[PDB]
Write an enzyme that holds these catalytic residues in place. Structure first.
Site, PDB file in Angstrom:
ATOM      1  N   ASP D  37       0.786  -1.610   0.136  1.00 17.28           N
ATOM      2  CA  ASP D  37       0.270   0.506  -0.398  1.00 17.28           C
ATOM      3  C   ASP D  37       0.991   1.309   0.565  1.00 17.28           C
ATOM      4  O   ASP D  37       2.330   1.384   0.293  1.00 17.28           O
ATOM      5  CB  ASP D  37      -0.799   0.231   1.129  1.00 17.28           C
ATOM      6  CG  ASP D  37      -1.739   0.661   0.576  1.00 17.28           C
ATOM      7  OD1 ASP D  37      -2.789   1.943   0.318  1.00 17.28           O
ATOM      8  OD2 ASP D  37      -3.482   0.128   0.716  1.00 17.28           O
ATOM      9  N   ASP D  63       4.027   2.947  -4.184  1.00 17.27           N
ATOM     10  CA  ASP D  63       2.869   3.011  -4.885  1.00 17.27           C
ATOM     11  C   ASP D  63       2.751   2.259  -6.393  1.00 17.27           C
ATOM     12  O   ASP D  63       4.036   2.896  -6.744  1.00 17.27           O
ATOM     13  CB  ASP D  63       3.497   4.800  -5.293  1.00 17.27           C
ATOM     14  CG  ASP D  63       2.390   5.777  -6.142  1.00 17.27           C
ATOM     15  OD1 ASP D  63       1.865   4.802  -6.703  1.00 17.27           O
ATOM     16  OD2 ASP D  63       2.055   7.039  -5.935  1.00 17.27           O
ATOM     17  N   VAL D  64       1.619   2.558  -6.899  1.00 18.67           N
ATOM     18  CA  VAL D  64       1.748   1.529  -8.614  1.00 18.67           C
ATOM     19  C   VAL D  64       1.818   2.171  -8.778  1.00 18.67           C
ATOM     20  O   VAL D  64       1.813   1.659  -9.939  1.00 18.67           O
ATOM     21  CB  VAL D  64       0.734   0.558  -8.022  1.00 18.67           C
ATOM     22  CG1 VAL D  64       0.107   0.179  -7.133  1.00 18.67           C
ATOM     23  CG2 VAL D  64      -0.875   1.591  -8.712  1.00 18.67           C
ATOM     24  N   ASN D  90      -5.366  -4.298  -7.058  1.00 20.45           N
ATOM     25  CA  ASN D  90      -6.509  -3.906  -5.913  1.00 20.45           C
ATOM     26  C   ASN D  90      -6.823  -2.329  -5.769  1.00 20.45           C
ATOM     27  O   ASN D  90      -8.174  -2.049  -6.120  1.00 20.45           O
ATOM     28  CB  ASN D  90      -6.758  -4.629  -4.787  1.00 20.45           C
ATOM     29  CG  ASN D  90      -7.599  -3.872  -4.139  1.00 20.45           C
ATOM     30  OD1 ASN D  90      -8.556  -3.807  -4.458  1.00 20.45           O
ATOM     31  ND2 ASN D  90      -6.345  -3.745  -3.025  1.00 20.45           N
ATOM     32  N   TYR D 155     -12.642   6.685 -13.018  1.00 17.78           N
ATOM     33  CA  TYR D 155     -13.022   5.406 -12.593  1.00 17.78           C
ATOM     34  C   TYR D 155     -13.710   4.763 -13.911  1.00 17.78           C
ATOM     35  O   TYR D 155     -12.869   3.883 -13.680  1.00 17.78           O
ATOM     36  CB  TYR D 155     -13.890   5.835 -11.364  1.00 17.78           C
ATOM     37  CG  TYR D 155     -14.386   4.217 -10.464  1.00 17.78           C
ATOM     38  CD1 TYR D 155     -15.033   3.984 -10.766  1.00 17.78           C
ATOM     39  CD2 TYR D 155     -13.447   4.100  -9.598  1.00 17.78           C
ATOM     40  CE1 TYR D 155     -15.141   2.738 -10.147  1.00 17.78           C
ATOM     41  CE2 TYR D 155     -13.625   2.918  -9.006  1.00 17.78           C
ATOM     42  CZ  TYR D 155     -14.541   2.042  -9.192  1.00 17.78           C
ATOM     43  OH  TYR D 155     -14.650   0.561  -8.835  1.00 17.78           O
ATOM     44  N   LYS D 159     -10.995   1.640 -14.991  1.00 21.97           N
ATOM     45  CA  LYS D 159     -12.250   0.105 -15.345  1.00 21.97           C
ATOM     46  C   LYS D 159     -12.388  -0.716 -16.135  1.00 21.97           C
ATOM     47  O   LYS D 159     -11.796  -2.025 -16.484  1.00 21.97           O
ATOM     48  CB  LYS D 159     -12.686   0.065 -14.129  1.00 21.97           C
ATOM     49  CG  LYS D 159     -13.345   0.405 -13.188  1.00 21.97           C
ATOM     50  CD  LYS D 159     -12.162   0.092 -12.222  1.00 21.97           C
ATOM     51  CE  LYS D 159     -11.669   0.226 -10.435  1.00 21.97           C
ATOM     52  NZ  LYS D 159     -10.712  -0.957  -9.946  1.00 21.97           N
TER      53      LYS D 159
HETATM   54  N1  LIG Z   1     -16.040   0.358  -2.353  1.00 17.26           N
HETATM   55  C1  LIG Z   1     -16.737  -1.141  -3.487  1.00 17.26           C
HETATM   56  O1  LIG Z   1     -18.069  -1.063  -3.054  1.00 17.26           O
HETATM   57  C2  LIG Z   1     -16.309  -1.363  -5.225  1.00 17.26           C
HETATM   58  C3  LIG Z   1     -16.677  -1.730  -5.887  1.00 17.26           C
HETATM   59  C4  LIG Z   1     -16.349  -1.806  -6.896  1.00 17.26           C
HETATM   60  C5  LIG Z   1     -14.642  -1.775  -7.749  1.00 17.26           C
HETATM   61  N2  LIG Z   1     -14.214  -1.476  -5.964  1.00 17.26           N
HETATM   62  C6  LIG Z   1     -12.675  -1.399  -6.553  1.00 17.26           C
HETATM   63  O2  LIG Z   1     -11.854  -2.665  -5.396  1.00 17.26           O
HETATM   64  C7  LIG Z   1     -10.928  -1.969  -4.770  1.00 17.26           C
HETATM   65  C8  LIG Z   1     -10.483  -1.857  -3.185  1.00 17.26           C
HETATM   66  O3  LIG Z   1     -11.665  -0.486  -2.622  1.00 17.26           O
HETATM   67  P1  LIG Z   1     -11.683  -0.279  -1.008  1.00 17.26           P
HETATM   68  O4  LIG Z   1     -13.803  -0.045  -1.118  1.00 17.26           O
HETATM   69  O5  LIG Z   1     -10.621  -1.768  -1.127  1.00 17.26           O
HETATM   70  O6  LIG Z   1     -11.117   0.665  -1.317  1.00 17.26           O
HETATM   71  P2  LIG Z   1     -10.447   1.147  -0.162  1.00 17.26           P
HETATM   72  O7  LIG Z   1     -10.083   2.728  -0.097  1.00 17.26           O
HETATM   73  O8  LIG Z   1     -10.485   0.563   1.632  1.00 17.26           O
HETATM   74  O9  LIG Z   1      -8.449   0.387  -0.286  1.00 17.26           O
HETATM   75  C9  LIG Z   1      -8.171   1.303  -1.664  1.00 17.26           C
HETATM   76  C10 LIG Z   1      -6.226   1.662  -1.026  1.00 17.26           C
HETATM   77  O10 LIG Z   1      -5.364   1.622  -2.123  1.00 17.26           O
HETATM   78  C11 LIG Z   1      -4.441   2.811  -1.692  1.00 17.26           C
HETATM   79  N3  LIG Z   1      -3.384   3.534  -2.737  1.00 17.26           N
HETATM   80  C12 LIG Z   1      -4.081   4.577  -3.450  1.00 17.26           C
HETATM   81  N4  LIG Z   1      -3.336   4.775  -4.937  1.00 17.26           N
HETATM   82  C13 LIG Z   1      -2.469   3.523  -4.523  1.00 17.26           C
HETATM   83  C14 LIG Z   1      -0.931   3.786  -5.206  1.00 17.26           C
HETATM   84  N5  LIG Z   1      -1.437   4.469  -5.984  1.00 17.26           N
HETATM   85  N6  LIG Z   1      -0.592   2.735  -4.515  1.00 17.26           N
HETATM   86  C15 LIG Z   1      -0.270   2.002  -3.761  1.00 17.26           C
HETATM   87  N7  LIG Z   1      -1.682   2.053  -3.074  1.00 17.26           N
HETATM   88  C16 LIG Z   1      -2.478   3.258  -3.192  1.00 17.26           C
HETATM   89  C17 LIG Z   1      -5.304   3.402  -0.813  1.00 17.26           C
HETATM   90  O11 LIG Z   1      -4.184   3.493   0.240  1.00 17.26           O
HETATM   91  C18 LIG Z   1      -6.030   2.090  -0.409  1.00 17.26           C
HETATM   92  O12 LIG Z   1      -5.183   1.581   1.518  1.00 17.26           O
HETATM   93  C19 LIG Z   1     -10.857  -0.821  -5.399  1.00 17.26           C
HETATM   94  O13 LIG Z   1      -9.795  -1.038  -6.470  1.00 17.26           O
HETATM   95  C20 LIG Z   1     -11.991  -0.345  -5.842  1.00 17.26           C
HETATM   96  O14 LIG Z   1     -12.041   0.559  -7.130  1.00 17.26           O
HETATM   97  C21 LIG Z   1     -14.617  -0.965  -4.583  1.00 17.26           C
HETATM   98  C1  LIG Z   2     -19.951   0.945  -8.009  1.00 21.54           C
HETATM   99  C2  LIG Z   2     -18.442   1.008  -8.260  1.00 21.54           C
HETATM  100  C3  LIG Z   2     -17.673   1.176  -7.067  1.00 21.54           C
HETATM  101  O1  LIG Z   2     -17.748   1.368  -5.568  1.00 21.54           O
HETATM  102  C4  LIG Z   2     -17.450   3.217  -7.269  1.00 21.54           C
HETATM  103  C5  LIG Z   2     -17.369   4.123  -6.011  1.00 21.54           C
HETATM  104  O2  LIG Z   2     -18.505   4.067  -5.808  1.00 21.54           O
HETATM  105  O3  LIG Z   2     -16.188   4.036  -5.349  1.00 21.54           O
END
Ligand SMILES: NC(=O)c1ccc[n+]([C@@H]2O[C@H](COP(=O)([O-])OP(=O)(O)OC[C@H]3O[C@@H](n4cnc5c(N)ncnc54)[C@H](O)[C@@H]3O)[C@@H](O)[C@H]2O)c1
Ligand SMILES: CCC(=O)CC(=O)O
Ligand SMILES: NC(=O)c1ccc[n+]([C@@H]2O[C@H](COP(=O)([O-])OP(=O)(O)OC[C@H]3O[C@@H](n4cnc5c(N)ncnc54)[C@H](O)[C@@H]3O)[C@@H](O)[C@H]2O)c1
Ligand SMILES: NC(=O)c1ccc[n+]([C@@H]2O[C@H](COP(=O)([O-])OP(=O)(O)OC[C@H]3O[C@@H](n4cnc5c(N)ncnc54)[C@H](O)[C@@H]3O)[C@@H](O)[C@H]2O)c1
Ligand SMILES: NC(=O)c1ccc[n+]([C@@H]2O[C@H](COP(=O)([O-])OP(=O)(O)OC[C@H]3O[C@@H](n4cnc5c(N)ncnc54)[C@H](O)[C@@H]3O)[C@@H](O)[C@H]2O)c1
Ligand SMILES: CCC(=O)CC(=O)O
Ligand SMILES: CCC(=O)CC(=O)O
Ligand SMILES: CCC(=O)CC(=O)O
Ligand SMILES: CCC(=O)CC(=O)O
Lengths: 260, 261, 260, 260
Positions: D37, D63-64, D90, D155, D159
């Protein structure tokens, strides 16, 4: 019949291939066209040819990755022709390489031209089109926006992305009389593809006709290159007042590629 | 003006009302010879005759698309009258909405027979005519219901999904023969069928007709409007024309943004 | 270790191939399995071998096109095991021909077994599953539910339709603790396909290996047949309590076929 | 049973949300997991917790978007656990706004993190996975990789793009015992989303339950947030040796969102 009678079309990458044919075909449909490309020499020549033939045409060169330059090219269009009715995001290029040999910068550049460039165009035409409650946005994508092809990580990522952008943009202006569609061709008979046929025929040591018929068109059911004229005809329909109910679509012209 | 279908013969099933009827009238204006085929042999004769009074080439060739023998003879009558079939529009259909548990199996089978098997029978009997002339346009009138689900439409959505399956197989089988096979997929079109359904929903829910349309039908339509039959006919003209020879195997969507979200 | 412990699985066409494997693997995961096929003698011996291995198995033969026999097979399952938790609409067959040589009756039959059969199973298990607020329906489809293939008008029409039925059914029980998914395999190593390899090998006068490697698998990026166990592992996941959030989906296991 | 026994999993953005759950669930299934992370203290904290519970975990922040840092994090993993078997791209973030007031640099940032970051990850694990003829790459996408949503230009573009990259990558390694899939959730119960419910409740002066049940879940047939556990269970299956035949897929778990 003038299907785009006096409609103002801004076409990125219109100095060659698909964009140039769209511009010629749109002018013949009665559109006021803007020739926009990196190459400002070929832009001025193209627009001068169209003007000599009695068409309304403007040279407004820009790099679509240059937001300030794209902005001023739209403002030049507004000053010249009063408005923008149609944006064709057509500017692009190709780099084929395995992922392991695929320079990150080249990946980023394919995305910047073909995704961020489309987003920049949409961002600066949207206020013009929403003010007048009319617009047609066509993102030139590809079947590579719907399926995978090995060695095209950057191109297929960019074209996938511009289909997502198309859908977001469509939803945001669906009430404003503006359509946003991705026209997705298969293999088109262009300089680019004639280049690749040239490339294939040396690198595989087969004829130009064998490079085309046995490898390029192996997964094309109609076993033929699309003409630039066919792509421009679909573009004309989608850009017309008759296609007002088409929005948010990956519109496919591919001789059956994605049907199998 | 131009005649985008000049010199072409268009056979249109279900062409005595709604979308089929607009397609027939507009195909005629684009210089096609049109065959009005429907269940109601009365409305076909009247439709074809009214077209003839307006200077168009129309034939009444009634048939039930589920009657392969009557369909085959309607195609034969068209060959006898106009010489060939260039464009087939598989448009005949109907609707029955019910939860799956109250959805009669026979009504499910009938929806599939009219809208899937009917399109198959039409294709099988135009393919040899089109292949011998190395030219053809086949448009299956499907629906966005061919690409997504809607609760209560088990039979309709099953038939329309299946006709998109049939479109792809057909497109692949005639790709080298100058024939295209596409599925034109409308969303909500302002037709009797739909105005009927708005009345139904407005009764059962005791909302006004505007409430049923604007709050229920159009909730899912980004453009917040019904499409016109004219809009569907304009897409059908482009796909049926010489200009669209490179479009085949496609679910071609005109839906006001419905499937975009 | 027992992903389907205490669940009752009704599996149509489970006397051979994928359905048989799904029945055996589901039993190993602690499900009570109903063997249901055309051949009643094979359902009896299958259910009996399962019983000799300490599994709970019932013979409930029916023709899935016979709604009265299907309904009675579901009722017998309720009588014997108390409920239906999992329905696997798997029964099918294939007929390959050019549309011109494709008998309308055979087209109708393919659709009646693989679409209408599925509708009949769903219609008769939905009230049971809705009453207990728990169900898993898996329609065994194919990538031929998602793409076209020459000579398969009947099969591709049926499979496309069952994906349509799948999404409708999903939306109607989404709030009721029931999922409805279409599992879509590519080429699986089954009697059916081993038959088709032998066919192609005679018809083209090639090895069994060449018929498989060069014709059958030319469109499969992984260049392999899927095992019935791989299909069964995806079926177990979708049929398990862990997949409650997956519904209305064409779930694809195809060694990359649909990626191209 | 340990479905990922002796596998090394590298998970970007695993300090929180779905990524954190996948790391903890992959660990329970016998994976050696790498916590990576932006937050470097949270990675050491997370990895230390897993180590205290008898799990193999390594902190490898990056950082990715920093290819040099991402390459060194993959190298550290090779040094510590011998190989990379599973890559989970992720890391992501969100920024919602109409296209007109959507900063170009933010649009670029979403794409750079969620598409280019995945490209960098894939580019540096492919030679490791190809050498050993085994790999599992899962790009965390979203249903926003398949449909449009107003206000998420960046976004949805990113995606959509990552699904394109997934199909390309799958085709490039389909013969090498490597799968590349995009896991596509709808609304998951995460800090991210609870945040968004908090905003909707405040900017629309309604209850948190009002804002979730009537607005956020309006287009979700099952009318519920998915759990991070549910996402992790599909992730485990996709990442297991049982899913060798699934590749180049947008794998959807959306409680029926995309079925209507
Ligand atoms: N939240 C939802 O319902 C949902 C639905 C669809 C898709 N997603 C996808 O699932 C994944 C996880 O989302 P989440 O809800 O766990 O969010 P989250 O914010 O809890 O996790 C995101 C993490 O990515 C890290 N991050 C951000 N930019 C970065 C970078 N450049 N390098 C490294 N780390 C970085 C952040 O520090 C954070 O720890 C994401 O890719 C998101 O698009 C989420
Ligand atoms: C529904 C996909 C998603 O997590 C986008 C957002 O609302 O951050
Ligand atoms: N030709 C095909 O086979 C094919 C296939 C599918 C779709 N497309 C797409 O349609 C479009 C047309 O390609 P083409 O075949 O006409 O190629 P082409 O090489 O003939 O034309 C591309 C043009 O884009 C211009 N350009 C490149 N980067 C630019 C930038 N940043 N700003 C402005 N102009 C820029 C170039 O100067 C050139 O004139 C491309 O986006 C391509 O991906 C082409
Ligand atoms: N109206 C809409 O909003 C809409 C939207 C999408 C799809 N569609 C599709 O477009 C087509 C036209 O729809 P519509 O609303 O105009 O009409 P419809 O679906 O109600 O049917 C139109 C005509 O089909 C005829 N017909 C019915 N069964 C027949 C049979 N067995 N043989 C021959 N003719 C038969 C009827 O007599 C009628 O004239 C249909 O396939 C429909 O499913 C309509
Ligand atoms: N084999 C593949 O590669 C493959 C690929 C894609 C999808 N599928 C689908 O998965 C399912 C299983 O295929 P398979 O290869 O194991 O088939 P199979 O032919 O080996 O076995 C299917 C079984 O269905 C039974 N059956 C046929 N019609 C029936 C009816 N009306 N009622 C009851 N039982 C009936 C047969 O007796 C047989 O035992 C089918 O729906 C098939 O279309 C298979
Ligand atoms: C989309 C097919 C194509 O033409 C990609 C390219 O090579 O530019
Ligand atoms: C596709 C819209 C439609 O025509 C379904 C219906 O008949 O309600
Ligand atoms: C012989 C094809 C088949 O298995 C259909 C049926 O069982 O009715
Ligand atoms: C891959 C779908 C299928 O099962 C075709 C066949 O019958 O081999």
């Amino acid at each position: 019949t003038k299907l785009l009678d006096g409609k103002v079309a801004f076409i990125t990458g219109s100095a060659s291939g698909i964009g140039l044919e769209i511009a010629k075909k749109f002018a013949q449909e009665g559109a006021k066209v803007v020739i926009s490309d990196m190459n400002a020499e070929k832009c001025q020549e193209t627009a001068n040819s169209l003007k000599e033939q009695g068409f309304d045409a403007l040279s407004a060169p820009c790099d679509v990755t240059d937001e300030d330059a794209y902005k001023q090219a739209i403002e030049l269009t507004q000053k010249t022709f009063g408005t923008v009715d149609i944006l064709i995001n057509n500017a692009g290029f190709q780099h084929v390489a395995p992922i392991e040999e695929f320079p990150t910068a080249v990946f980023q550049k394919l995305v910047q031209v073909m995704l961020t460039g489309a987003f920049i165009g949409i961002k600066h035409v949207l206020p013009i089109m929403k003010a007048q409650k009319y617009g047609r946005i066509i993102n030139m994508a590809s079947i590579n926006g719907l399926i995978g092809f090995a060695g095209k990580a950057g191109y297929n990522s960019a074209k996938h992305g511009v289909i997502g952008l198309t859908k977001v943009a469509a939803l945001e202006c669906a009430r404003d009389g503006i359509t946003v569609n991705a026209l997705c061709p298969g293999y088109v008979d262009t300089p680019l593809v004639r280049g690749q046929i040239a490339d294939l025929a040396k690198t595989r040591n087969v004829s130009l006709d064998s490079a085309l018929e046995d490898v390029i068109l192996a997964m094309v059911p109609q076993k033929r290159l699309l003409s630039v004229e066919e792509i421009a005809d679909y573009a004309i329909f989608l850009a017309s007042s008759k296609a007002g109910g088409v929005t948010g679509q990956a519109v496919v012209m591919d001789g059956g590629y994605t049907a199998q």
